[PDB]
């Protein structure tokens, strides 16, 4: 019974800027330590005790805090740093923080939208999935609405999100609407549309069923 809540859960920095994420405790604590975790690999040692850096970590990292509120600071941001940073205490119960997702920030990108009618193979099985790919955009926060025959739906939409690209530093999203065969053939014009802080009006992509 000793919680750590780490303050900015997701954070986006551009290269060359300062970065301060915080770890705040439910009660007073002697020291706190930090680990780093990139996609697909375990946590690595980063900062131990409070201000002591591990052999590998660059010198532009820094640690501080006393009592209830400690904090890891990055002097100048470089793209090699993006990973989730956990804190951990060692005084009572060995508790980890929730982490701080560190993101690279780039110029905004609007997605490259692609819609796909269900396969001739799935339909013969009793089902029909309509799928929409919004590809290479930034930032990440998007809204997507599927409109069928001009009305709209939210039942059975599955939405998945990549991790930030290691080259262009974008994100990709899939959107799958899982109907029935009979539900699918009940309508004509399936449309997915993407709203975003880039374009003012949505990016629409459409097809009609009674066509094939």
């Amino acid at each position: 019974d000793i919680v750590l809540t780490q303050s900015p859960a997701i954070m986006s920095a551009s290269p060359g800027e300062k970065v301060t994420m915080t770890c705040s405790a439910s009660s007073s604590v002697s020291y706190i330590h930090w680990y780093q975790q990139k996609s697909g690999t375990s946590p690595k040692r980063w900062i131990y005790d409070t201000s002591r850096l591990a052999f590998g970590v660059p010198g532009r990292f820094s640690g501080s805090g006393s009592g209830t509120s400690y904090s890891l600071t990055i002097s100048s941001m470089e793209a090699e740093d993006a990973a989730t940073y956990y804190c951990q205490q060692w005084s009572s119960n060995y508790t980890f923080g929730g982490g701080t997702n560190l993101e690279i920030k780039r110029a905004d990108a609007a997605p490259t939208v692609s819609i796909f009618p269900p396969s001739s193979e799935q339909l013969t099985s009793g089902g029909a999935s309509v799928v929409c790919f919004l590809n290479n955009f930034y930032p990440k926060d998007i809204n997507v609405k599927w409109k069928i025959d001009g009305s709209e739906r939210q039942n059975g939409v599955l939405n998945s999100w990549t991790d930030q690209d290691s080259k262009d530093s974008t994100y990709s999203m899939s959107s799958t609407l899982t109907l029935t065969k009979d539900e699918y053939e009940r309508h004509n014009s399936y449309t997915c549309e993407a709203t975003h802080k880039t374009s003012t009006s949505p990016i629409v992509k459409s097809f009609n069923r009674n066509e094939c």
């Binding site: 020291y31 946590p43 690595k44 131990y48 989730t84 119960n93 490259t112 999935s129 590809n135 998945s160």
Partner: protein, 217 residues
Amino acid sequence: EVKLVESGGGSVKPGGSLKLSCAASGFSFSTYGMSWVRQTPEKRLEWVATISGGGGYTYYPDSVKGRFTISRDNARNILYLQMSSLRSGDTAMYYCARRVTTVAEYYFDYWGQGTTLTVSSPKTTPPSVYPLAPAAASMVTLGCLVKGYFPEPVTVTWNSGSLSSGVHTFPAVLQSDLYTLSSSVTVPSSTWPSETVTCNVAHPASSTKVDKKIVPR
């Protein structure tokens, strides 16, 4: 180099028992305390056990105390985590970590690669693969919807590795206690459909690999 390499795990029905092991290399095992730490799919870090350098002392959190036992054998440089009466909350990837002494505390220096432990009662199901071809420009985005599979690690390889540099893979989202993922690829119009694009789905938990030539409607 310091190595920590852990073995065992997979899919167990709730109530089963299991044992995880971890093997040590390139450091004197007996002189260090060794712990396990678990991470939830939602990237949640929870400490689960600790043994001393000798036998000496063991310590446990109050989420597994009673079900887990942590053991070393310093003849072989290997940890052991026996887990009895597994429940649904025990699903996680489990790492072994070295614990080193600091000024007044301790700290986890090296962590292994983890094994994964899925506690659940459903069958292992192979995946249904459906092609995603369009029903008009100079670059084509194709896809493969990979749907209805249980044990979660799947693999999608496109033209047998060739098109990696233009592939987006989308994490499997769960619903209906089956997993559903998607994968997209991008291709210059000069490449398709003049040449075959085929995505390839392999599902090691069932030893099933399916192929799908994306052909154009």
